[PDB]
Amino acid sequence: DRRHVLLQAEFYQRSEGPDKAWAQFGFHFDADELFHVELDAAQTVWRLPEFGRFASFEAQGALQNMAVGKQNLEVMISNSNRSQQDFVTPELALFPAEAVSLEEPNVLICYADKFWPPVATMEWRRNGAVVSEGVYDSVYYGRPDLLFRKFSYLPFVPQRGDVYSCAVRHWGAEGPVQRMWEPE
Amino acid sequence: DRRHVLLQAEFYQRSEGPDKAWAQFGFHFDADELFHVELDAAQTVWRLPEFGRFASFEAQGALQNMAVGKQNLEVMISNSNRSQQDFVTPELALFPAEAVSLEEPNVLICYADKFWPPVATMEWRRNGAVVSEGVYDSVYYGRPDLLFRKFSYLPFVPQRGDVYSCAVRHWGAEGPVQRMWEPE
Amino acid sequence: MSMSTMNMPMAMKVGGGSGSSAFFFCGAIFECHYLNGTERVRYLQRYIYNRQQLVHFDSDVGKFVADTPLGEPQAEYWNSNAELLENIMNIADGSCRHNYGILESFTVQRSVEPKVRVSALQSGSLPETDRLACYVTGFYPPEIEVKWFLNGREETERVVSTDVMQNGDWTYQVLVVLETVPRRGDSYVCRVEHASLRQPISQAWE
Amino acid sequence: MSMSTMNMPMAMKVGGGSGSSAFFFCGAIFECHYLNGTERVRYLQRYIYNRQQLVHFDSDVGKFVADTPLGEPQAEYWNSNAELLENIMNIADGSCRHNYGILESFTVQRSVEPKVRVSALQSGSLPETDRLACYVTGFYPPEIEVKWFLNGREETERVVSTDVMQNGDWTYQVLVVLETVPRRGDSYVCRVEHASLRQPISQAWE
Ligand SMILES: CC(=O)N[C@@H]1[C@@H](O)[C@H](O)[C@@H](CO)O[C@H]1O
Ligand SMILES: CC(=O)N[C@@H]1[C@@H](O)[C@H](O)[C@@H](CO)O[C@H]1O
Ligand SMILES: *[C@@H]1O[C@H](CO)[C@@H](O)[C@H](O)[C@H]1NC(C)=O
Ligand SMILES: *[C@@H]1O[C@H](CO)[C@@H](O)[C@H](O)[C@H]1NC(C)=O
Ligand code: NI
Ligand code: NI
Ligand SMILES: [Zn+2]
Ligand SMILES: [Zn+2]
Ligand SMILES: [Zn+2]
Ligand SMILES: [Zn+2]
Ligand SMILES: [Zn+2]
Ligand SMILES: [Zn+2]
Ligand SMILES: [Zn+2]
Ligand SMILES: [Zn+2]
Ligand SMILES: [Zn+2]
Ligand SMILES: [Zn+2]
Ligand SMILES: [Zn+2]
Ligand SMILES: [Zn+2]
Ligand SMILES: [Zn+2]
Ligand SMILES: [Zn+2]
Ligand SMILES: [Zn+2]
Ligand SMILES: [Zn+2]
Ligand SMILES: [Zn+2]
Ligand SMILES: [Zn+2]
Ligand SMILES: [Zn+2]
Ligand SMILES: [Zn+2]
């Protein structure tokens, strides 16, 4: 039970038609995120802000890795003669953080798993209406099988008859994947 | 492990705005359906046609129960002063009958559970397009907690990249509950 | 032989009494509980309005019992009718025992063998961990024992079993996953015991 | 203290070479596997294009190894550069051990107690069966033992456990359900053992 893994994971990706570029740099411990760097702002963002009281990371190293990783992306695009792979659709889990009691505060978790590439937005609805107050979206966590996963969190106070949904729009997809959840 | 239950379960229901009436009469053994009567045609329909080689049921008894049950419904509507209850939304499970191998035939099962009242239609999609070839829809199975459940079956031969959905439209609902499933 | 209806048609008495959208539901359920085949049988009637049981009948008691106030008139009305109660006690003995005799051979004694597939995936996170899946399908009745063995010894820890799942067509399925770190020479075997099998099925991994 | 980056920026060599919609992905992963704290550490580099690992580096081997043909030029190119390989072996010892020293107290030694709720529902089908749920939430690390006891004796049969589920916020949850027919006088107790507890939690049903 006693092994642990620290991972520095980075990715650089781009789409044509439409044209868009993305980048991520994070540290991960076992299944959990330590931090990611906001590459625009050269800012380390700890997954739990208390981690920042015990350690620091200079984003300089991430800015250097981003530059070389974007160039390596163009090298692999040319050496592969622009070879591409099939997208893999997200699988959704939708569950509360805690034991549900009506009119007591809680957090609904939408977990998108086993998808590729790591581009996916979550949309929350309550009784068919879009809700977004206090929502937190995670960065993309890798898997040994080279697919990705992501978490979104909706703070909620449940009423009898509420119906919650999480919809995941994966890049290029003709429609979202969706899951519904009801209290009790 | 040795107890068994045989149930004769019947229900009579009606909606106003819009006006519609439904009726069901079935026998059930433990969690499974023995038969239901097609009340229009006075026909016993066995869940597995082979059951009909071992037993028979005359639908006359069901036609009599339907008549009295529809009258008892009006009595309870008047004695209760038209008392009504909140609808309970379906919870969906979506799983294949058998171990999936690409390009081998199988059956996807959409199980709608813990809903009330027992009025709910399943719609199947493959890659966003409606599919209905060979679909079987079950009648409504009761639960000790007075909620209902229903099964729908989609024959399929999976290709890499297929995305299946089952959508359940419950009576009166502003939108369907939905679940997606992908092979591998 | 022909199965018998497990009630006689019984009429409720109108007696309080009296925006636009509305829904009304009326259920009746008649149950034979076979506690030890036909040596011990409990017959129940249940009358339901919407999501509430108004009144029930227990063959062990022999009279209607109101569970809510909407059932109190009906219980008192039916309980004063010795013909109703005598007809119901005849069904509660005759019909349950008659229906059981017809059903026994293809329900109580239905036997469909499980099919067993063993496969493995790496988990979704490091440290490196294998998930050995024992997928068991197509069986009846739903009672089954599905256990993982490592080098002849039963594995307890890090075994996750789904519930036996109803397919709705008189067959059931279950998935039992062992999370493990394999070492070379290790022998992992899924063992499935079921009433339908003369001997257990043993399917080893790779 | 300040954590160190676990690679040095390394450039690939262009060398084959060359409808409208397109997607391209490039990943790099640097892993310190702590097999026995810092007494035994394996450092890996992985380079990925789309969904394929082109080339990796194992600190135990000390050279790049191509996994596909797209990685063979890069492996051969990097392997001829003693400065690259020496820099990488310095990180593989220094950085893994340095980062572990900083992280240990709030990761390896993070300890958050489980909360335990016991509840019961009737199953969705007769014969009458109770599902006793032991819901365990908010704990770290994910390793936990959750067992049902009937009258002081551990229940094995008809226990279904979900996997320990990741909440994604450094806490985990699990659900263990015992299917049972309760008899009067029966005492059912959920017992939870976890590194964070001085004594096991024992929560009885009703
Ligand atoms: C196979 C089977 O159903 N056996 C039961 C048995 O438990 C009981 O002893 C008997 C009463 O004589 O009723 C039978 O129906
Ligand atoms: C609490 C902890 O991490 N202990 C480990 C220990 O297994 C090992 O003996 C030691 C090497 O001297 O490395 C430590 O990091
Ligand atoms: C069930 O029925 C038989 C008689 O047919 C009886 O002798 C047996 O002991 C009963 N079993 C139980 C456990 O009550
Ligand atoms: C782990 O490290 C210690 C030394 O710090 C060693 O003595 C111990 O036996 C090692 N354990 C294993 C199981 O290799
Ligand atoms: Ni007879
Ligand atoms: Ni140091
Ligand atoms: Zn363009
Ligand atoms: Zn961020
Ligand atoms: Zn920014
Ligand atoms: Zn510091
Ligand atoms: Zn997609
Ligand atoms: Zn009208
Ligand atoms: Zn029909
Ligand atoms: Zn008809
Ligand atoms: Zn016949
Ligand atoms: Zn509804
Ligand atoms: Zn019973
Ligand atoms: Zn007895
Ligand atoms: Zn009673
Ligand atoms: Zn079960
Ligand atoms: Zn056999
Ligand atoms: Zn490892
Ligand atoms: Zn050692
Ligand atoms: Zn290697
Ligand atoms: Zn697990
Ligand atoms: Zn404690």
UniProtKB/TrEMBL annotation, chains A, B:
GO cellular component: MHC class II protein complex
Chief location category: membrane
Subcellular location: Membrane
Keyword Zinc-finger (UniProt): no
Residues that, per the record, bind Zn(2+) 3: E38, D40
Membrane topology: Single-pass type I membrane protein
Binding of Zn(2+) 4, residues: H170
GO MF annotation, one: metal ion binding
UniProt entry keywords in alphabetical sequence: Disulfide bond, Glycoprotein, Membrane, Metal-binding, Signal, Transmembrane, Transmembrane helix, Zinc
Residue intervals of the Ig-like domain: 90-170
Family, as annotated: Belongs to the MHC class II family.
Name of the protein this chain belongs to: MHC class II alpha chain
Full-length numbering of the shown residues: 27 to 207 of 255
TrEMBL record, chains C, D:
Residues where Zn(2+) 3 binds: H56
Sites where the protein binds Zn(2+) 5: D163, E179
Lipid bilayer topology: Single-pass type I membrane protein
Compartment(s) of residence: Membrane
GO cellular component, one term: MHC class II protein complex
Keywords recorded for this protein, A-Z: Adaptive immunity, Disulfide bond, Glycoprotein, Immunity, Membrane, Metal-binding, MHC II, Signal, Transmembrane, Transmembrane helix, Zinc
Molecular function via GO: metal ion binding
Disulfide pattern: C32-C96, C134-C190
Residues that coordinate or bind Zn(2+) 4: E113
Residues bound to Zn(2+) 1: H33, E128
Domain Ig-like: 114-202
Glycosylation sites recorded in the entry for this protein: N36
GO BP terms in the entry: adaptive immune response; antigen processing and presentation of peptide or polysaccharide antigen via MHC class II
Binding of Zn(2+) 2, residues: E39
Protein name: MHC class II beta chain 2
Organism phylogeny: Eukaryota, Metazoa, Chordata, Craniata, Vertebrata
Whole sequence portion shown: 30 to 215 of 263
